[model samples]
Target: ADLLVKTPEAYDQALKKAKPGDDIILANGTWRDFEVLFEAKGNENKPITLRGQTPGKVFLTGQSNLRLAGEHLIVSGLVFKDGYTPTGEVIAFRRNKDVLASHSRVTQVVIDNFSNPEKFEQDSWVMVYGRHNRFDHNHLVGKRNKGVTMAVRLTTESSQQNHHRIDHNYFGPRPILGSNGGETLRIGTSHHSLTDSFTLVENNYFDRCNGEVEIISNKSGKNSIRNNVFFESRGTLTLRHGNGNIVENNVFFGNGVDHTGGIRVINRDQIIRNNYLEGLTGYRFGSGLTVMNGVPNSKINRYHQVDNALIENNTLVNVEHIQFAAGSDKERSAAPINSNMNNNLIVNDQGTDGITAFDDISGIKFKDNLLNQDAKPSINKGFEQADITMQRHDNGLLYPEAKTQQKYGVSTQLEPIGKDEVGVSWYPKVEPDVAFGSGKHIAVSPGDNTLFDAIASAETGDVLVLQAGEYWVSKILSLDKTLTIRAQEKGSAVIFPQRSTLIEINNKGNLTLDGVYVDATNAPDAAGNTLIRTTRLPMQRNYRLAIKNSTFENLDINHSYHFFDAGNRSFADYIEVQDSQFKHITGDLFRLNKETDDLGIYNVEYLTIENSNVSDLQGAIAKVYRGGTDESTFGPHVVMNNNIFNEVGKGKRNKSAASLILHGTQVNKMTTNEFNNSAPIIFELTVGEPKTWVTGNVFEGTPEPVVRDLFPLSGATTTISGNTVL
Candidate 1:
């Protein structure tokens, strides 16, 4: 039988009397701050469980500390919502000062809004100083105050690195702390960076946790970071002082947020492969993939030259800012040799340039890579172009034909052509959770059941399934409730909107439109017209809107049609439009016209526009204007992936007709998008430039691709690669 503790006194007594296979449960109450020293022993098969009666309701408040000195024990459901750790870390996985704790786990717990009064080198939320420990599936939020969120430290007495696994956790928001040392997860310090930690961090979600430049900083060797999602987080997974490590299958979804760096590589004998980076805005320290040259036997804090590195099979889409051997002239002059960059795909659909490198890097091998047609290939001080014989199979795998008899180039041959055999296949499947209808499904016929009446009678979370026919609506529809409007069959339903403004959305809830076609032929000129508009006040939150597999045609007009027009006073936090087609649409598609607000928060949390096609634009496709004074003013996370732009901005060759116009705002990523017969200038940036990225695109136009008004060399973080120019 298990033991139950009602008070802190009883909890202390139960811990002393607990044995193997014992379950000590603490009731749901306000457990005040106290130091806990759990020094019990248990076998692997019968581990002790120290769990709470309720998961999140069992709050632990005040100055608290937990030092677990046990083996094969599981601590679960303990929540610390409001607390301060005065004695260094709030939780530590260790026996004593120098000895290592082994075979313990901390799971299903929450440490939210916890901090220390004073910022110091020793204080942290969780200090892992053990072997074979796991910290997984925990929610750590609001670590704003001081110290690191999670620190994996090595013992000074011993030279051995700890073996640990941290995975599937949700790390929440942390704003900029102005100085260094506020990393979300730091594995080892500079002193132990060269030691073999043998740690693995995977499948974690870091959301806007803007602590410092190094988010998940690695200062140890033989460690790996895989399958993690960094969504709009303003930092990089930097290998600051490590060697013999691997960074693979991680998704850096910047979505055009400023200061969003992907991965920074330093040290020697490291492998960075099969990673996907998009829409990053940081340049030197925060490039999508930055390699630095280290000083000879440099200190941990000093810059390091990267030698014997293998960067292969990575996919960078719409990521323009990538640096190699970046630093001062002294740092670049100390560049290491024997690095290879092979079989990577750097594609750009928008923006002017691609990738750049510094220092003498001619000793590195560059082969079988795909780059934008316009970007330079100077990583090894030379590059070779390939024949355009790459084909995409029906199973969505890309393969190069051997007709040109070339083994390595822009379009090189590969042994296998599947995602599993190629770049970054460690993500979840691309299928939507609810594609057609999951909620209350309401069917609408063409003439018998009017679309307007169906929408009017539908409640929240209702799905309006349209039949195979054309439905014309003249009146402007304003949606406030959560709803899903989709076609019964994929391309069978078509809707034509009349007048200037077709539909308006006040984003109080979620809205999704899938597999329906909308023709805007009857709409007025784009000068003041808009096919769709959205508005959300500053106080409102949790608003998301997605439009996928839908078609919008004949939106030809002067000026621009704001497909997603977030008005001056409001905005939608999350917006996604993918697998759609826009035919004959003139003017801009997305206009992020957020004026200087009082709160100084002008950003969309996540915006993804991917796998779509656009044709016949008179002006630029997207014009983002965020007039905030500081860099954090405009942190919109935007991703434009695998889109095709044809005959856009044909009339004007000036900056107005460029594919992307960035004014103060950031373009987190623009990857694998294609442009055909478009304006000469692709990307136009005004005021301050924020990490321009145009990678891995196919361009067939008379005009050359150029990035205009990128002031100074620091803002010239452009990554152009694997593009075809015909």
Candidate 2:
């Protein structure tokens, strides 16, 4: 029989003297002043349950905010509002809650209208300082108030915030009782000691009435911030540590002049994508999405932090520019030691510059995002607010999108797109009659007729077909227009790297690399460094490039670290490399570099590396470094299928994996991949667990199946099913 206590007088004796496995329920109506404490210690199955008698109307007003500190303590239907208390700090979990225990759930807890003017205290309604807990379906409101503390503060220093979920909650943006000056929810380390954390913050709504809503930073935490809404704020809605963090599927409204960003993170590693930003603030013309890494005057560094973040596939207005900086100078303290930014949009206006890849550690990517700097004389009111003519100029690629469904070719109608509109027709066209030969035909090659010259001279939608043969080339080859270069037959065309990269395709596409070989041996004029550096050593360039091919040989001893490095620090789009080989690299092979350190896939996009063999490398097989990105949208979409990693070399190598490292946060699909002799694939500070269909992949010579350390390890809604071993 369920026993019910009618009054606080009787409830006090039952709660204090209760044993394990006991259940206590509070009745409706205004309870007298009470200070309750639970001295009973419950075991795993005999845990205590303290709940409100009513669902939404059961109000608890008193000196304490229901002190709950125990393993498996379930608090539901609690309406905590209009509690008059000063210097009140609610919900403290000390040595009572064993952190390592799993499956702890806290649900349906509401804290609203519980502010006092003369409290002269830091009033925090709810705080989570524990681990392995779930806070779901909670409503915390502090609107129309002042001097109120954060709605939800997670200040644990545990290396793994391991599996702590804060979902389906409403964080208030109203004024505090005395002075509204605190974040809605702050998820960070202890600030003094560096801690690695893992947390999943999703499906939450917050309005920044006084300050930033969320802060997740200080150290490396595999944290995920997804599907949230932000409105009326003075600071960034979300902040992150630059390492192993992902922010996606959020909406930003009225975040302008006074300061309000959809998402923000500093010099660690993070990803922001698939979010919506609307409204404008005149002085804050740079609204929407912004990332900074010690980029002079940015606030992220004001707290002695670095701004290493990635932004992608987010639409915003009233944006002035996207900026990034990197240097050894002490002045740039907030800038990430390394940074990358990429793949975002500024609609009905011009983005100052598509991307800025700055400093030694800054790799910025600006990919497939629209921008419009139209001369709107009809709405011109001020000079500072008017949109400037936008021109996307930087180190990254402005290439075409890929066409995986059909055989692609080059097209002339491909024009540069802005970060404002959809329906872009930027894609590489396929060359006609460039399919595999039925029988053996005469050997053909695009020798001496430089690929750089062919691309520059061709019109849009042009396909330059190369016959099967060996072509000797010198100097750097650049393709600035949309076009396709294909081999007459697969495995018949070869490009010998005499000086610089065999081919350098930047910022334009319809680019297809198929049935080709890039051979670059040690030479006197090899521009890239010739250092057999360890993977731990800074990555070096070896055999600068080998774009597309079915079979590869003797691509040994040169400089450069990537098959193709495009885009600054954002996403590289519509670039396809199928049935190819990247091997025999003397130093580091196939790295996408960024000028600034933002977060996103600014290196390559719509990239398909299929049915290829990458082996015998000194260092990494493919390295996509982060540069720049938006909160939520799109960065790089890569499909790596049916590739083989064969580690071959004389010296002890550091990286011998399909992808040595992944820097920026992207939505990637890695399927049917095989790793023969390599280390684990590293995802440095990724946001969402990535929609990784890592199926049909074989890993040999390693004891572990995969070595991953991202936060939550998996997504709350993501499915990591049907993964095979051996």
Candidate 3:
């Protein structure tokens, strides 16, 4: 029998009377904030069904979710959009702590952009718990916040060896979360690392899931991750803290992007075989098949040695490097032991070496591998040089030619799945990589509250163009949407904040500022006297701030008034200050020094100070620090090129600290710049596989040094060349 209910209250009343083989359908309309407990029980043959009247017509937009419990229930045909979950999870298998959902299936649903506005607040879009539950044929996109997008919870004993099946889903694009806790899918946590989940994840399409390094973090034991397609996702399928996990038959297409890694093994008895890796270019920790050094006598949360790892029948084409015993330090000193790599084919057409030895090799054996003539391996014991030829097959993917595909690579041909083949058919076929659609233009004349009123009424992609005059802003502008605030004429309008910072930024992508002047003179009651502050800690989106041809000056009186203040819990994709000037009173011009821990996360991945002038500062110019040993992020990449720094670095930290106190950045390049009477560039290299290049610069009237004495750690490269000091 079929029953129709129009409202959430009516649906709840009818659900209580539903019997076996009954179908309860929700009416087509908008259901706002309707949190439900869908609890019903039925046998295997006569399962209970709950669905929308029409798929993609019943829209759940505000603070909505469904918690399913009981057995043999099928739920489908619902779309959640425009709002985040009020609770932690938008979909949960269990109704509460004691109740559990088993033998249930949730399919043909869409969860789009249901993310918290404040990215630091962590929540999962789909949380699968209980035993023998199936979550498949769904489309989940635009998860721009902290926490895993989909997680299989393993806290309860009934969830162990649950044998859940997750497949045929389309996981769309997610940006690089500035901090940790942004995996597309995670199996378990460190507390349950050794427990057996026996979950099977297969036949899914992960497109650009670039949310923190691990695309799929497998933390529970005895799981199978197979037959997945990782397409240009700047991360790896990390076996982070598990054992006896099989990672095989997955296709990786990096397409020469940076940090696009393959599988990462960190625990014992892991199986890695029959995977196809193409054009991968991740570094040590994010490499194709990185077998890392273990933390000695490690805890469950720490890195375990890669012991008895099986690597066989894998194919690598144009892959950059495969390292063994990598990330070895004095503390994390144990290497991979009792491992065997067999029947692999590796070729590089990019004219570089494919494999490099970083630590002890006597512990592992390599056999019957083929390498191309382009990338020579350092070890010649187990590899034979061969000519590799490739051809594009019928499925628009490249595979080795039949003559060269004898027995070294995968037994079957590589298969790349499409999103259309996986997700539900009722969902709309829209592109995932489009920009936030720009709205209408908005203009604001010079007034105390006119700028504030204009910004408050603007939407995403709104262009707030300010006309020439002084705009006195009494309160901080809470920027929660993607918009551009530009001057009518370049550097003709001034924004003067009296009691608040000019901008407290949040949101994702393209919060741009151009052709303006910010005067932070006599601004009291502002936190840190900061003109601009990134307020969200653990900022979980790839936020980009582009400022050019601007001016920021006049602190009035200096007491740690930073012009650009970035919190440690916060992170950004990139921040560029070009063709700008910073003058007069300040403490730290750019302060990202709030983090003092060793968890190995930093602020922006790329920071550029190019074609700018910074002078007469009372403290350091730029301060960034990243410490400890977690290697999931490659951040604080600095490029201070073609700039001028004169009469800077005095008092406060100017005497002891250099003007640019950048520490633990992986990539540092300061080229073709000029400096006079300013402190030298101080790159305190403590912990990173970093490379420093300070070249073609002219320094005058600097008494002490060209670059501060750098004692680089192991695997550090410092290049100080082609510069003059007068």
Candidate 4:
């Protein structure tokens, strides 16, 4: 039943004479420069095994190699250190190029500092050309020489052979060589890039792999990359020339570093979904997600067109950009066909665009996305923004999704999840202000007549009527006094700001704009600039700002531009925007002030927004509180009830964006709010206790409602129930 091999010679004898159900165990020692070709056939229930008595102590060093050439062979608990092979492969599944090995495995092995000598080049650490072979739970590190670290090749005879699984393996550091050809793992080459290999790569950890361009390149079709973690690796998981591949549930944590890419999409029928990206700062090819244009019908060296791509339900926090078409100018002009991007979230602080299509996009469906940018989104070339919103989640990992688990990355000691372990069932751990009125009224005609002068001359409770016409102003219109500015008729007055912000509010004044259209896109200056800025005068009272029955059109500014940037020293007792139509507004909608007093009470409170139509927006519609520590306590009563948000946020660079962001705050209710194709994330609340109530909300897209510490406990206090999601 078992045999003990104490030396290389004895191991060779065991390899030559092993039978079915045999166990060949190697003693603890260094076996130098040895070669073993195992060729015994075994049944499925009684496979032959060659294992080490002690895993790391039994080392295979100095030009050693191993090959399995028969069925049902298993090798485990071996370590390879300082090993080289002149045959260009440290391990092979087949004895020769023409032979086929099926149902063999190499698991729980460590290949460390193993490579060809620096003087030699063009060799792989492990090569497989067999069917149903498994490589799992192996740690491969310091592959410091030429060629790819591991390769799964398909020969002409086995071009259609599938069912090879590579999972739970750890690929550790490989330095930058200043050139190409240092991929940690490659499935196919140019010779069979279009062929179907159907390999599966899952639950692996790729750490600090600084190889150029392609880290884990997939050059074959119908393969899958899932549940893996790529941490601080200066390369992408390049679907260089493959079709029908899936990249899902992966975590790419770049910590806002440059060159830490997420995924590069090329070819056709690729689906990338449910992934999490944090602090990734790559642009274009290295972006968090990029779809490349392909050259038609050309093989190898030629880019291929991307078709039928589905990018959905993904979350991006502090990523640089998400590109629909990325390549050289000539290449992006071709535009990928039939690409669908739905229910994605982009929250960044870097001020990058949410979605950039370098060329004209056709045959693409972009819907139900959220972006938090400070300016007009870089949406051009016939790329229509449909049902998107400016939404934010204060914390991306508030719920127990697949990507939010504590132990989500690579594991060296644990076994991979079997087919029975799939399909995990889970649950999601997933406010108000104000009053206003009509008073005394005064009417002023448009043109050179100063509207601010009319407001200054009126009483504190007076309404200044804006007569119907197109109005253009160059100076900043200040509304320091409490007043209501309404159009003489609804949808008749259009206000344009040239080269400066449209308006500002000072002190603790209460101001409202009704039935007027504010347009800041007439003569735009810098992108992402602010359209409105508010100044604060010390006061114990809460200020109020409301916009009703008004339309804001083409207000494109740089990062600071928005409908209102309330001063940092002022707080909002009541802020309401109702029955207004905001079209093509960029940056954000409103910013409220918050601070800690000597007694440590946060000074932000109350927001009520209802019956508004907000479209073509980015960033958060309103930000009430600045970010603070997880332990800080901020309380606000926020009620976002009965509002229509369409095509609102597809922001490029902000840490968090949404319809509203209330960090460190509690006691908020989001009820009956209609988010038509909104951001993937609807609410992110991390503060005090979980006292928020989310009910009767209608979400029309892929919605991710997250709550931190929402463990599956019975009788939870927070009310998260009765919502319809489409």
Top-scoring candidate (TM-score): 3
Taken over the whole model, the C-alpha lDDT of each candidate is 0.68, 0.47, 0.81, 0.68
Instruction: Give the 10-residue window scoring lowest on summed lDDT in candidate 2.
Output: 536-545
Tens-digit lDDT track of model 2 for 1-726:
133666767777776766667767777665534544433456667766666677665676765455555566555666665564433544433323344223345566665556653222345655455566677766655532223343333444442455577776655544322111344565553341234556677776664543222322223356677766655554454453325677776655554534344355454556666565555341111234445444355343233345445566554555433334312234444445444333444444443422333344334433344444452321111111223232222411121232320111111122212211211112111121212222222233466755655655665445667776767765555544444556777667776766544555442223445565566652334434422111221111111122465555454554433344343322232445566666666555545544344523244434467777777766665566544423232334456788887662222444444345665445556677777666655555354224444556676653223435444432312333444445
Question: How would you encode candidate 1's per-residue C-alpha lDDT over 294-315 as one tens digit per residue?
Answer: 7876767676778899988776
Least well predicted 10-residue stretch by lDDT in candidate 4: 423-432
**Runs in model 4 lying further than 4 Å from the true structure:** 331-333, 373-376, 380-726
lDDT value, residue 425 of candidate 2:
18
**Residue by residue across 1-726, what tens digits does model 3's lDDT show?**
898999888888888899989988998998898897899997899989889999989888888988999999999999999787899999999988889999999998999888886666889999888999999999998887778999998998988899999999888888776567879999999999899999999999898888878999999999999989988988999999989999988989899987899788888999999898888988787787788889889999988988999999998877787888788877668888899999888877766556766778777898998877667567788888767776667755555675556588665565667768988888875655324336777888997888888878888778889999998988887777777888999878988888647787765435778788888775884435777777655454556677788888886454667777886567777788899988885667877766777566577788898999987877777788777655677677889999888877765645445777777787888898887887766767765567789889887875433343334445677888788989
TM-score of each: 0.56, 0.45, 0.88, 0.53
**Runs with alpha carbons beyond 4 Å of true place in candidate 3:** 428-459, 462-478, 485-500, 515-529, 535-542, 551-561, 585-587, 596-601, 627-629, 651-656, 684-688, 703-726
RMSD (Cα, Å) for all candidates, in order, is: 12.0, 27.7, 3.7, 25.0
Q: State residue 153's C-alpha deviation in candidate 1, in Å.
A: 0.8
Instruction: Indicate the residue-level lDDT of 118 in model 4.
Output: 46
Candidate 1 vs candidate 4: the lDDT winner is: 1
